Structure formats: C-alpha cells, structure tokens
C-alpha cells in the first residue's frame, strides 16, 4: 500500500523464480484504489488502573451493528491480475497460472 | 530502525500488568448480527488506593 509505482511496465522481482520458497515482489504500474471502513459507531471509556494510569477500552456501540470491510473495483482488479499474468507467463512459458 | 523506533516510542506508556485478571464475559451483541465479535467482560480493577 501507498508505495512508489513502476515507470512503464509491471516488474516481477524474485531471488530465483525456481525456488518455491522465495517471495515474488510484483510491482504494478497503475495503482488500484481500496476503500476500507469500520462502520459501527464505537465509543471509548477510561478505566483508572493504579496511580495516574488509565486504560481506554470500548464502552458501548451506539446505533446498529454493521460489518467492517474493504472495497476494491472488480474490473480494475481483474485487469491488474490479467496484466500480472501477462508479465508472469513470459517467465513460465507455455503454462497457465 | 523501525524496531527500535517502535520500542522507544512504546517505552514510557501505560503497562497493562494489573489488568491480567479473571474476566467474566457474558455477551455484548444482542444476537449474532453481522459478526458478534464483541464480548462484555467485567473484572475487579484496582483503584488508586
């Protein structure tokens, strides 16, 4: 998240690309926007513990209770996975990923 | 640098040693809802005295 982008092409970096225990850093060219939220209205209460120290915790939830989630566009994410597949099939030729 | 910055920022804050006690937790969310991950835990905290 929030990184620097590649210049013109998706760049696939790994130590070997044949050892299966090596993490592949895929570097995109176009960023994909994610929107993350926790929608339930939460509160805060302070519980005094010892001299001069407090402890902040959840006191109550006001309103209805909904689901914390994140939203990505499906078309853009499909296009990004397809372009990563384009750049990745030339390192694993004549194969389906 | 990230590890040491995290530790030296987290050093002078409140330590939660007196809170590790026996918790009585019944229920917080009314029904299953979306995810009933809340839990209403009560305990015997220590005051200034």
């Amino acid at each position, epitope marked *: 998240l929030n990184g620097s982008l590649a210049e013109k092409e998706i760049v696939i970096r790994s130590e070997n690309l044949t050892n299966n225990a090596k993490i592949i850093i895929v570097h995109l060219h176009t960023p994909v926007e994610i929107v993350c939220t926790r*929608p339930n209205n939460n509160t805060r209460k302070s519980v005094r513990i010892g001299p001069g120290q407090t402890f902040y915790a959840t006191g109550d939830i006001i*309103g209805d209770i*909904k689901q914390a989630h994140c939203n990505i566009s499906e078309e853009k994410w499909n296009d990004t996975l397809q372009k990563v597949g384009i750049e990745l099939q030339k390192h694993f030729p004549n194969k389906t990923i | 640098d990230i590890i040491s910055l995290w530790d030296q920022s987290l050093k002078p804050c409140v330590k939660l040693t007196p809170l590790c006690v026996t918790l009585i937790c019944s229920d917080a969310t009314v*029904k*299953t809802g979306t995810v009933e991950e809340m839990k209403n835990c009560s305990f015997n905290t220590t005051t200034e005295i």
Partner: antibody
Amino acid sequence: QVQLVQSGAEVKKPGASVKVSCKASGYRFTDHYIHWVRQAPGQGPEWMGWINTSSGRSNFAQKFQGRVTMTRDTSISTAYMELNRLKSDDTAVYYCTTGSWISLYYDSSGYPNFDYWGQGTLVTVT
Amino acid sequence: TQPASVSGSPGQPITISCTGTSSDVGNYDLVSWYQQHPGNAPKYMIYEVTKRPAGISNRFSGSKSGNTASLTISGLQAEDAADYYCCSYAGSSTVIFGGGTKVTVL
C-alpha cells in the same frame, strides 16, 4: 402493494402494559427497518423507536428508555411494541412505519425514509 | 422549530420552513416532509433533502440552507390544506420531527 396491519383499540387503567402488533404483507419483513411513530391528538407526531428486523437489535428515543421493549417474529413476519406503566398522556395514535433498506455494510437505521404507514391504533388511557 | 400555520391563495407558491441546530440539519442532510389530512395516516412525498418518490408530481420541492430546510409548494389546491411536518435524523441514531404547519388554502 404492501400493507401493514395494526391492532385494535386498547382501553385500560394506568399502570398496566400495552402490546401493539404490526403485521407486514407484500414484501419481505427481513429487508426493511420498522419504525414506530406516536401522535397525540391535537399534537404533531413523534418518533419513538426503530428495530432491525434481521437481528432483533432495537433502539428507542431518549426518554422512552426503561418503559419500551420491541420484539419481532420473522416466521409470521410481524413486530410487537410493549409499553409498560402507561399514564393518561399515553392516549395517542400508534403507527408502524417502514423505514430504509437493511444493509449489512452501512448503518441506514436512522434514515427517516418512512415509506409505508400502517393504519395505526388508538390507545386510550382512562 | 416550525411555524404554526401558513395561509395562501390558490395558484401561487408558498414556503414552509424548519430551522434546526447544527446537529439536526446542519450536520446531516437527512430531512423529510410528510403531509397529513385530518382523520388519516400521514402521507410521504419527500425522503431525501430534495428527492421525491414515484407517484408524486412537481408540486412540492425541498431545499436546505445552512441550519434550516424549506419546502416550497408551487401552487395551491383545495386538497393542499393538510398538516405538514418536517422530520430529520438527529444525533445518536435518533429521529426528530418538526411539530406542525397548517396550510390554509383560500
């Protein structure tokens, strides 16, 4: 066309409890919020509470706490309003209204989109 | 807050206002208008700050300025003498009303 059926008149002495039923027809009971509106005669209406019909979570007004409970049954698709310790000022018309769309991702409970109103009931405290 | 009553001749627009606080109308644009004939359930023709549901013509139009919301009725007819109430979201998932405006169509 959807329609909400409400109960008949309730005549009783002060100090007792009143249950008001609201039965929905024509649409799914689980899909929409149910709000309650109390209107005294010669007086404008007043919102009194909402219920989530999917999980039974309900909230009331700032001064109806401790006197009001709200239940529902999704099998026969109805909601119940229980009011305890009535007084002579509780003589009013009670309305079951259909609110916003129940969604799993955002809080649309407080939206005052009262689409369909029931026929209401009259509660007279003598 | 709401004016007690308004009066007007047929064929001309009128305005009914509702002045709330910053938390009621200023923070959230959730305002609505409901007319009510006597001896009947309240109607429903405004739900958002300006929108209208199906089956309602362009007689009524909502607007919001600052901390108040005004409903403009473009022309007056004999059935337009009902009691009008404004309504809004207010604070901690609660809903408040206006109180009432009686329209006197001449």
